[PDB]
């Protein structure tokens, strides 16, 4: 089976990145890494960090990520990551690092950690956007550079969101992508948003439902299963008011089961057990790579 | 006891640092790390590397380093090293790094790794020279910045070592890295090489001749005042012949033990026990670090 690696630091994420994973995970060997070591490249409150790792894990599970199916782990719990990362920072060039479009040295040297994340698992696909295209080009060069010197250890990874989905825009600025990092909470809808916020958020000159309206349609159709033409027919003479009233219900219906599970997980001692399994599985596959890598460089014995 | 940490990548060395430790290990908690991870910041042949790691260990044991006493281990075998290094590579500044007095990024980022090497063990002293003084001030700075943000978790380390020149250039310092193999005497140099190297205008033994006295004076236990006396009214030929014998006598039992360690499988066992011990101390420091930063659970 092919290998997929996703490193994770809104309904736009569910719909673009996170949704097709609940089933893709059945046809692929999937890894969902919570990159907490990448997160400290910037200022964190230890309490929020620790607590943000938890919710994320519980959310991926609440969404349908199956731990029997996929490997969901926390990056720092697999030391092979920081190990392979060091070896790769020894083969990478500063020039390469500074040329990175995107001060603590972590802001500069994190690219080799992201490459280690990927290369450790002999991954084939990396479900990332164009914003990470440069990071992938680089981990692909690093793999090639190492495979040529020491002989082939790595699969050269490819940048793909297999079965990718509609791009979700902001509710305040439909020319802007939906981002949880938005200063206006009204711009996005969070997977944990309560029925009432969703409604209010959805509620806030031409008047025709035909493909901001184009964003509400993309949201409506992916979430309801209907085609944009179905809905264009459905609302042929209808106003934005009832369309929105309808759309707010399909969003609440989607997030309800999700939110109900997120809470069971957050309360379950099974959450900690699922992450323990995932790091064991990962440490195993990763630990093996690290020693094949050292074997090749002449490290230790 | 106070903790001493030494990271290792001639007789100049032995006289300088390594020899005293044989006594010190009993009074201090000493760690002798073979920095194989630092070694890869520059081009290595995988075979020679793997090989040099082995002999360095055998040489240290052969010199008198007591494993029941100190901790001799290979850096790569303690993962906590690269983990702490990353955490410290996020608090260090690039500017800090770039002013580093000393291309592959390993050549710019290894300082945070060298500070972790030290900080992981709550080391009090680091027995290094002046060339590392910029390196130590930086690790004292990183520890400081960390404690003040998170709380008191590292002992601020001191750089103190509780000078032999080249034999071909007495204004230059002895260094294996000399293009000229006669500039130095290796610990493994045979008796013939030792003699030759030592044989190679005032003609008076008073303090390149001041260097020989210093080599002699300390491998012998005698003193310079007492050696000047001894060698009143003789010249360099005898002085040089007696001195080649104190050097052969010194290195001979070291070479015997070294060879025994090199084919003994107690070697791999001393190293296993060594990494095990390090992993224990370091691992705990690491989870204490992630605790302060909020990493994992
Ligand atoms: N508003 C959005 N619309 C579509 N895809 C998104 C949106 N927000 C995040 N993603 C995707 O979800 C994943 C999370 O990465 P990030 O871009 O940081 O959000 C990536 O693959 C993004 O491409
Ligand atoms: N030729 C030498 N003369 C005196 N001390 C030396 C000599 N070589 C090494 N040392 C000491 O032993 C160590 C090895 O030097 P280095 O490992 O390059 O920093 C240092 O701590 C020096 O202070
Ligand atoms: N760097 C990515 C997250 C990430 C870390 N490691 C990865 C490995 C593969 C894909 C993505 C990642 C981001 O900014 O969100
Ligand atoms: N960087 C040192 C060796 C070293 C690595 N880590 C260390 C920690 C403490 C003291 C020295 C070291 C050298 O150039 O030789």
XYZ file of C-alpha atoms and ligand atoms in Angstrom:
674
model
C 0.000 0.000 0.000
C 1.060 3.587 -0.623
C 2.160 5.782 2.276
C 0.641 9.138 3.210
C 2.075 11.570 5.738
C 0.270 14.595 7.112
C 1.801 16.861 9.745
C -0.744 18.931 11.655
C 0.252 21.971 13.694
C -12.347 25.042 10.512
C -14.901 23.569 8.111
C -12.437 24.694 5.454
C -9.874 22.224 6.746
C -12.426 19.435 7.125
C -13.585 20.054 3.573
C -10.210 20.500 1.890
C -7.716 18.392 3.791
C -9.327 16.402 6.548
C -12.527 14.907 5.160
C -11.324 12.591 2.393
C -8.976 11.069 4.969
C -11.758 9.218 6.785
C -11.946 6.899 3.775
C -8.587 7.433 2.059
C -7.165 5.953 5.247
C -8.661 2.650 4.081
C -6.848 2.614 0.767
C -3.598 4.130 2.012
C -1.063 3.689 4.785
C -1.759 6.978 6.597
C 0.124 8.937 9.259
C -1.341 11.888 11.112
C 1.456 13.605 12.984
C 0.759 16.365 15.492
C 3.905 18.411 14.941
C 4.375 19.933 18.410
C 8.115 20.291 17.796
C 7.354 22.507 14.813
C 5.007 24.561 16.997
C 7.717 25.838 19.354
C 9.515 27.630 16.535
C 7.107 30.346 17.652
C 6.117 31.518 21.116
C 3.755 29.156 22.919
C 2.030 29.090 26.281
C 2.966 25.656 27.641
C -0.582 25.198 28.954
C -2.374 26.040 25.700
C 0.122 24.061 23.625
C -0.318 20.910 25.701
C -4.080 21.429 25.615
C -4.124 22.186 21.879
C -2.356 18.897 21.111
C -5.152 17.046 22.917
C -8.109 18.711 21.193
C -6.496 18.188 17.820
C -6.034 14.465 18.428
C -9.589 14.137 19.769
C -10.848 16.103 16.751
C -9.154 13.903 14.168
C -10.731 10.936 15.925
C -14.084 12.641 16.301
C -13.974 13.284 12.547
C -13.602 9.595 11.656
C -9.852 9.038 11.636
C -9.510 5.377 12.584
C -6.558 4.499 14.858
C -6.837 0.816 13.921
C -6.549 2.129 10.374
C -4.154 5.068 10.592
C -1.235 6.162 12.758
C -2.106 9.253 14.752
C 0.777 10.310 16.952
C 2.535 13.241 18.559
C 5.845 14.143 16.899
C 7.861 14.640 20.103
C 6.980 11.156 21.336
C 9.016 9.705 18.475
C 12.600 10.898 18.964
C 13.623 9.504 15.556
C 12.239 12.795 14.272
C 14.764 15.046 16.000
C 17.463 12.497 15.211
C 16.903 12.156 11.462
C 16.398 15.943 11.459
C 19.944 16.549 12.698
C 21.495 14.307 10.055
C 19.529 16.127 7.353
C 20.579 19.561 8.602
C 24.108 18.287 7.979
C 23.430 17.594 4.300
C 21.258 20.653 3.690
C 22.879 23.942 2.691
C 22.276 27.250 4.417
C 21.684 28.800 0.984
C 18.827 26.369 0.553
C 17.449 27.296 3.996
C 17.632 31.077 3.550
C 16.104 30.878 0.083
C 13.046 29.493 1.855
C 10.467 32.199 1.014
C 8.534 31.637 4.207
C 15.077 35.611 15.148
C 15.212 32.136 16.612
C 17.132 29.599 14.590
C 14.075 27.332 14.602
C 12.370 29.638 12.065
C 15.290 28.935 9.753
C 16.158 25.285 10.512
C 12.679 23.738 10.729
C 12.629 22.673 7.084
C 14.930 19.707 7.779
C 12.611 18.593 10.602
C 9.654 18.641 8.225
C 11.692 16.569 5.757
C 12.630 14.091 8.466
C 8.913 13.877 9.353
C 8.189 12.821 5.755
C 11.251 10.733 4.824
C 11.245 8.668 8.031
C 8.107 6.794 6.952
C 9.111 6.190 3.346
C 6.102 8.275 2.364
C 4.832 8.492 -1.192
C 2.247 11.260 -0.903
C 2.196 14.473 1.124
C -1.228 16.143 1.229
C -0.099 19.779 1.211
C -1.028 22.995 -0.597
C 1.039 25.202 -2.904
C 2.308 27.060 0.179
C 4.379 23.973 1.054
C 5.449 23.205 -2.512
C 8.872 24.674 -1.800
C 9.263 22.624 1.363
C 8.496 19.471 -0.632
C 10.826 20.366 -3.511
C 13.500 20.646 -0.854
C 12.766 17.370 0.978
C 12.768 15.768 -2.471
C 16.215 17.246 -3.186
C 17.455 16.182 0.242
C 16.266 12.627 -0.337
C 17.906 12.527 -3.781
C 21.106 14.030 -2.403
C 21.279 11.356 0.294
C 20.209 8.440 -1.919
C 22.922 9.328 -4.428
C 25.665 9.584 -1.819
C 24.897 6.658 0.475
C 22.633 4.711 -1.868
C 18.895 4.592 -2.086
C 17.165 4.683 1.299
C 14.285 7.081 0.675
C 11.190 7.121 -1.440
C 11.100 10.520 -3.141
C 7.831 12.025 -1.912
C 5.200 13.780 -4.034
C 3.000 16.767 -3.194
C -0.612 15.644 -3.584
C -3.991 16.139 -1.974
C -5.553 12.957 -3.372
C -9.270 13.426 -4.050
C -8.896 17.110 -3.197
C -11.957 19.245 -2.561
C -13.428 22.706 -3.019
C -11.528 25.716 -1.679
C -13.391 27.361 1.193
C -13.366 31.156 1.370
C -13.898 33.592 4.225
C -17.438 34.500 5.231
C -16.449 38.170 5.634
C -14.119 38.376 2.626
C -15.035 35.863 -0.069
C -11.875 36.716 -1.910
C -9.882 35.393 0.987
C -9.325 31.754 1.930
C -10.928 30.638 5.199
C -8.328 30.678 7.979
C -8.623 29.875 11.692
C -5.884 32.474 12.113
C -8.321 35.195 10.989
C -8.748 38.246 13.269
C -12.501 38.191 12.577
C -14.066 35.086 14.156
C -16.981 35.622 11.778
C -14.708 34.724 8.851
C -14.556 31.006 9.598
C -16.709 28.291 11.095
C -14.938 26.035 13.572
C -15.637 22.308 13.869
C -16.441 23.075 17.503
C -18.740 26.009 16.791
C -22.097 25.634 18.537
C -25.312 25.443 16.523
C -26.005 29.084 17.351
C -22.679 30.554 16.244
C -22.930 28.625 12.976
C -26.395 30.054 12.391
C -25.289 33.592 13.214
C -22.108 33.238 11.173
C -24.037 31.914 8.156
C -26.568 34.741 8.428
C -23.903 37.448 8.271
C -27.023 43.036 -4.165
C -28.060 40.855 -7.013
C -30.245 38.345 -5.160
C -29.864 35.143 -7.222
C -28.501 31.788 -6.029
C -26.156 31.216 -8.955
C -22.527 30.119 -9.067
C -19.666 34.974 -1.554
C -22.746 33.215 -2.883
C -20.356 30.977 -4.818
C -18.706 30.054 -1.518
C -21.964 29.310 0.296
C -22.787 26.967 -2.588
C -19.483 25.116 -2.383
C -20.052 24.686 1.351
C -23.668 23.644 0.843
C -22.970 21.019 -1.829
C -19.919 19.299 -0.300
C -21.773 19.054 3.018
C -25.120 17.965 1.539
C -23.920 15.751 -1.318
C -25.902 17.672 -3.930
C -24.371 19.232 -7.038
C -24.148 23.026 -7.452
C -26.673 22.713 -10.294
C -29.042 20.759 -8.062
C -29.049 23.719 -5.677
C -29.225 26.304 -8.457
C -32.353 24.466 -9.584
C -33.494 24.107 -5.975
C -33.385 27.855 -5.360
C -34.251 29.076 -8.841
C -36.388 31.959 -7.601
C -35.426 31.949 -3.940
C -33.741 34.570 -1.772
C -30.519 34.513 0.241
C -32.512 34.387 3.483
C -34.024 30.879 3.095
C -30.890 29.618 1.356
C -28.903 30.683 4.400
C -31.538 29.292 6.753
C -31.198 25.984 4.912
C -27.392 26.104 4.753
C -27.096 26.757 8.490
C -29.066 23.577 9.180
C -26.863 21.358 6.994
C -23.757 22.737 8.737
C -25.175 22.130 12.230
C -26.269 18.661 11.155
C -22.729 17.906 9.952
C -20.953 19.139 13.093
C -23.402 17.658 15.596
C -22.192 14.054 15.513
C -18.628 15.323 15.232
C -18.995 17.545 18.301
C -20.703 14.743 20.192
C -17.733 12.420 19.604
C -15.101 15.063 20.260
C -16.532 15.262 23.779
C -16.539 11.518 24.414
C -12.884 11.352 23.351
C -11.876 14.342 25.464
C -13.434 12.472 28.404
C -12.142 9.025 27.443
C -8.977 7.529 28.888
C -8.931 5.846 25.483
C -7.570 9.050 23.925
C -4.225 8.705 25.729
C -4.229 5.020 24.761
C -4.736 5.769 21.073
C -1.774 8.164 21.032
C 0.370 5.637 22.901
C -0.321 3.025 20.209
C 0.358 5.541 17.423
C 3.779 6.526 18.804
C 4.731 2.883 19.355
C 3.840 2.056 15.747
C 5.637 5.188 14.546
C 8.717 4.873 16.758
C 9.098 1.385 15.306
C 8.952 2.327 11.616
C 10.931 5.521 12.330
C 13.581 4.018 14.652
C 14.402 1.535 11.891
C 14.927 4.317 9.339
C 17.150 6.285 11.700
C 19.515 3.350 12.151
C 19.598 2.574 8.436
C 20.515 6.245 8.044
C 23.254 6.101 10.680
C 24.480 2.795 9.317
C 24.957 4.657 6.038
C 26.719 7.683 7.541
C 28.925 5.725 9.943
C 27.249 6.948 13.147
C 27.645 4.941 16.362
C 27.871 1.169 15.819
C 29.832 15.562 43.415
C 30.271 18.256 40.766
C 29.564 17.107 37.209
C 32.198 17.380 34.473
C 31.238 16.949 30.821
C 33.705 16.369 27.999
C 32.820 16.015 24.317
C 35.498 14.311 22.239
C 35.591 14.350 18.483
C 48.586 13.189 20.818
C 50.691 13.439 23.979
C 49.838 17.133 23.850
C 46.270 16.152 24.635
C 47.205 13.556 27.162
C 49.352 16.023 29.066
C 46.790 18.786 28.627
C 43.437 17.343 29.642
C 43.068 13.602 29.474
C 45.748 12.500 31.930
C 44.462 14.389 34.965
C 41.023 12.871 34.574
C 42.327 9.480 35.531
C 42.601 10.917 39.014
C 39.570 13.220 38.711
C 36.944 10.629 37.906
C 37.106 9.556 41.538
C 36.396 13.048 42.844
C 33.952 14.227 40.174
C 31.026 12.836 38.195
C 32.635 12.762 34.746
C 30.978 12.207 31.379
C 33.082 11.428 28.314
C 30.962 11.823 25.195
C 32.133 10.738 21.739
C 30.430 13.408 19.627
C 29.786 11.367 16.478
C 26.850 13.648 15.658
C 29.087 16.720 15.652
C 31.539 14.850 13.431
C 29.047 14.756 10.554
C 28.930 18.547 10.300
C 31.842 17.900 7.953
C 32.499 15.260 5.297
C 33.195 11.832 6.765
C 33.925 8.440 5.282
C 31.378 6.174 6.977
C 33.926 3.400 7.573
C 36.713 5.503 9.026
C 34.186 7.351 11.187
C 32.616 4.207 12.623
C 36.226 3.110 13.112
C 37.541 6.245 14.832
C 34.607 6.127 17.256
C 35.824 2.702 18.359
C 39.488 3.611 18.886
C 38.684 6.838 20.679
C 36.753 4.770 23.212
C 39.456 2.097 23.470
C 42.083 4.813 23.879
C 40.214 6.520 26.711
C 39.774 3.225 28.546
C 43.348 2.332 27.714
C 44.499 5.630 29.201
C 42.874 4.853 32.550
C 39.307 6.091 32.185
C 37.403 3.923 34.655
C 33.973 2.931 33.294
C 32.817 1.754 36.745
C 33.771 5.304 37.639
C 32.866 7.624 34.776
C 30.458 7.596 31.839
C 32.006 6.959 28.441
C 29.372 6.899 25.712
C 28.623 7.568 22.055
C 26.490 10.695 21.572
C 24.284 9.285 18.792
C 23.231 6.456 21.095
C 21.551 8.940 23.439
C 18.634 10.351 21.424
C 17.921 12.941 24.126
C 20.835 14.847 22.621
C 19.122 15.696 19.324
C 15.817 16.299 21.111
C 17.196 18.873 23.550
C 19.189 20.370 20.671
C 15.996 21.109 18.741
C 14.297 22.740 21.711
C 17.407 24.880 22.186
C 17.575 25.628 18.462
C 14.255 27.426 18.924
C 15.398 29.688 21.761
C 18.775 30.559 20.280
C 18.932 33.409 17.796
C 20.340 33.176 14.323
C 22.394 36.246 15.049
C 23.871 34.508 18.032
C 24.704 31.659 15.729
C 26.178 33.816 13.028
C 28.577 35.629 15.336
C 29.908 32.201 16.277
C 33.600 32.784 15.634
C 34.074 29.489 13.793
C 27.853 25.326 3.066
C 26.080 22.717 5.191
C 23.771 24.126 7.865
C 25.354 21.705 10.319
C 28.252 24.175 10.384
C 25.963 26.896 11.745
C 23.537 24.965 13.947
C 25.837 22.623 15.891
C 26.197 25.106 18.765
C 22.704 24.432 20.140
C 23.610 20.731 19.981
C 26.839 21.307 21.920
C 24.944 23.250 24.582
C 22.477 20.398 24.961
C 25.412 17.964 25.238
C 26.421 19.992 28.285
C 23.065 21.101 29.724
C 21.432 17.655 29.692
C 23.652 16.469 32.548
C 23.472 19.477 34.855
C 27.202 19.809 34.279
C 29.108 22.226 36.457
C 32.460 22.225 34.638
C 33.457 21.838 30.986
C 37.169 21.156 30.468
C 37.727 23.063 27.216
C 40.230 25.620 25.910
C 39.896 29.286 24.906
C 38.847 28.411 21.349
C 35.580 27.193 22.902
C 35.069 30.213 25.139
C 32.542 31.732 22.736
C 30.803 28.377 22.661
C 30.451 28.215 26.449
C 29.231 31.789 26.891
C 26.449 30.943 24.460
C 25.396 27.791 26.333
C 25.498 29.756 29.598
C 23.219 32.258 27.826
C 20.746 29.668 26.534
C 20.492 28.045 29.959
C 19.940 31.494 31.482
C 17.215 32.501 29.040
C 15.470 29.177 29.588
C 15.520 29.261 33.387
C 14.204 32.827 33.428
C 11.306 31.941 31.131
C 10.406 28.535 32.528
C 12.284 28.129 35.801
C 15.474 26.779 37.255
C 16.369 23.631 35.353
C 20.003 23.981 34.283
C 23.227 24.471 36.190
C 25.109 27.340 34.562
C 28.326 25.684 33.404
C 31.849 26.955 33.952
C 34.556 26.441 31.346
C 37.550 25.280 33.345
C 40.052 22.438 32.970
C 40.826 21.124 36.461
C 50.792 23.711 26.843
C 52.706 21.472 24.454
C 54.030 22.846 21.163
C 54.844 21.195 17.853
C 58.200 19.444 17.772
C 58.919 21.071 14.409
C 57.684 24.541 15.358
C 57.973 25.423 19.045
C 55.953 28.591 18.471
C 53.078 26.446 17.208
C 50.874 24.205 19.340
C 50.970 20.423 18.996
C 48.122 19.180 16.803
C 47.364 15.850 15.133
C 45.978 18.013 12.330
C 49.511 19.076 11.478
C 50.381 18.459 7.864
C 53.629 17.370 9.430
C 53.356 14.088 11.310
C 56.624 14.887 13.111
C 55.016 17.880 14.767
C 53.223 15.468 17.096
C 53.584 12.205 18.964
C 50.431 10.093 18.866
C 49.478 7.909 21.814
C 49.734 4.959 19.429
C 53.074 5.945 17.952
C 55.490 2.979 18.236
C 58.803 3.158 20.101
C 60.744 3.715 16.863
C 58.550 6.630 15.775
C 58.693 8.156 19.264
C 62.480 8.122 19.258
C 62.949 9.427 15.731
C 60.374 12.173 16.209
C 62.166 13.200 19.410
C 65.656 13.248 17.899
C 64.372 15.502 15.125
C 72.285 26.329 19.226
C 73.014 27.358 22.787
C 73.307 23.684 23.729
C 72.110 24.277 27.293
C 69.174 22.748 29.195
C 67.400 25.802 30.598
C 63.806 27.001 30.458
C 61.668 24.231 21.584
C 63.909 23.132 24.415
C 61.594 24.706 26.967
C 58.947 22.486 25.364
C 60.917 19.240 25.736
C 61.477 20.081 29.392
C 57.737 20.502 29.852
C 57.105 17.162 28.159
C 59.840 15.501 30.201
C 59.131 17.295 33.468
C 55.574 15.939 33.614
C 55.790 12.454 32.131
C 58.564 11.883 34.638
C 57.146 13.594 37.718
C 60.391 15.520 38.165
C 60.485 19.317 38.063
C 62.017 21.761 35.605
C 64.217 23.343 38.279
C 65.212 19.794 39.180
C 65.768 18.805 35.549
C 67.887 21.845 34.743
C 70.013 20.841 37.725
C 70.149 17.220 36.569
C 71.228 18.301 33.092
C 73.766 20.900 34.189
C 76.597 20.869 31.681
C 75.240 18.318 29.237
C 73.703 18.818 25.801
C 70.593 17.871 23.893
C 71.579 14.433 22.624
C 71.501 12.718 26.006
C 68.583 14.862 27.176
C 66.762 13.767 24.025
C 67.645 10.102 24.547
C 66.528 9.982 28.176
C 63.363 11.823 27.150
C 62.555 9.355 24.361
C 62.656 6.640 27.015
C 60.276 8.357 29.462
C 57.895 8.840 26.531
C 58.226 5.222 25.379
C 57.832 4.053 28.982
C 54.718 6.223 29.432
C 52.999 5.177 26.191
C 53.937 1.502 26.307
C 51.433 0.313 28.927
C 48.829 2.524 27.279
C 49.391 0.756 23.956
C 49.224 -2.662 25.571
C 45.851 -1.945 27.171
C 44.589 -0.217 24.030
C 45.224 -3.341 21.948
C 43.533 -5.572 24.494
C 40.453 -3.320 24.446
C 40.424 -3.304 20.653
C 39.775 -7.046 20.390
C 37.969 -7.395 23.698
C 34.189 -7.403 23.520
C 34.116 -5.737 26.928
C 34.552 -2.610 24.816
C 31.063 -2.764 23.304
C 29.820 -3.591 26.807
C 31.419 -0.561 28.474
C 29.758 1.581 25.802
C 26.368 -0.090 26.229
C 26.464 0.524 29.982
C 27.631 4.076 29.224
C 24.775 5.005 26.863
C 22.293 3.371 29.246
C 23.434 5.603 32.105
C 23.451 8.718 29.953
C 20.030 7.944 28.488
C 18.692 7.797 32.043
C 19.934 11.237 33.149
C 19.418 12.948 29.776
C 15.964 11.421 29.139
C 14.738 12.866 32.428
C 16.151 16.300 31.613
C 14.389 16.131 28.252
C 10.939 15.343 29.651
C 11.501 18.093 32.194
C 12.195 20.417 29.260
C 9.094 19.402 27.301
C 7.188 19.839 30.553
C 8.196 23.498 30.705
C 7.570 24.092 26.998
C 4.305 22.123 26.868
C 5.439 19.428 24.414
C 3.395 16.232 24.146
C 1.855 15.070 27.427
N -10.309 27.547 4.000
C -9.714 26.434 3.462
N -10.159 25.987 2.263
C -9.580 24.889 1.719
N -8.572 24.144 2.225
C -8.166 24.625 3.413
C -8.666 25.731 4.085
N -7.998 25.916 5.274
C -7.112 24.941 5.322
N -7.172 24.132 4.221
C -6.352 22.966 3.929
O -6.271 22.122 5.117
C -4.877 21.798 5.351
C -4.332 22.504 6.597
O -3.188 23.283 6.241
P -3.395 24.871 6.347
O -3.261 25.501 4.967
O -2.371 25.476 7.293
O -4.798 25.106 6.876
C -4.114 22.157 4.078
O -4.044 21.086 3.140
C -4.909 23.335 3.538
O -4.721 23.334 2.105
N 48.991 20.170 21.811
C 48.344 20.487 22.987
N 48.979 21.152 23.954
C 48.321 21.448 25.100
N 47.051 21.182 25.455
C 46.462 20.518 24.440
C 47.033 20.156 23.230
N 46.130 19.488 22.432
C 45.040 19.441 23.126
N 45.149 20.033 24.340
C 44.069 20.129 25.289
O 43.264 18.929 25.047
C 42.068 19.304 24.294
C 42.117 19.037 22.789
O 42.203 20.240 22.045
P 40.854 20.341 21.209
O 40.178 18.993 21.385
O 41.116 20.589 19.736
O 39.996 21.433 21.814
C 41.792 20.755 24.644
O 40.980 20.866 25.808
C 43.186 21.328 24.869
O 43.017 22.327 25.890
N 4.999 22.851 8.123
C 3.580 22.547 7.986
C 3.188 21.400 8.913
C 4.069 20.195 8.781
C 5.089 19.836 9.605
N 5.659 18.664 9.160
C 5.001 18.239 8.047
C 5.216 17.124 7.234
C 4.402 16.959 6.148
C 3.382 17.881 5.849
C 3.175 18.994 6.644
C 3.985 19.192 7.761
C 2.721 23.768 8.283
O 3.272 24.889 8.293
O 1.506 23.589 8.508
N 32.771 21.204 19.631
C 33.888 20.596 20.343
C 33.516 19.195 20.823
C 32.248 19.151 21.627
C 31.020 18.741 21.198
N 30.109 18.824 22.223
C 30.743 19.283 23.344
C 30.245 19.536 24.621
C 31.121 20.000 25.561
C 32.471 20.218 25.258
C 32.967 19.979 23.992
C 32.095 19.504 23.009
C 35.122 20.526 19.454
O 35.152 21.239 18.430
O 36.048 19.757 19.785
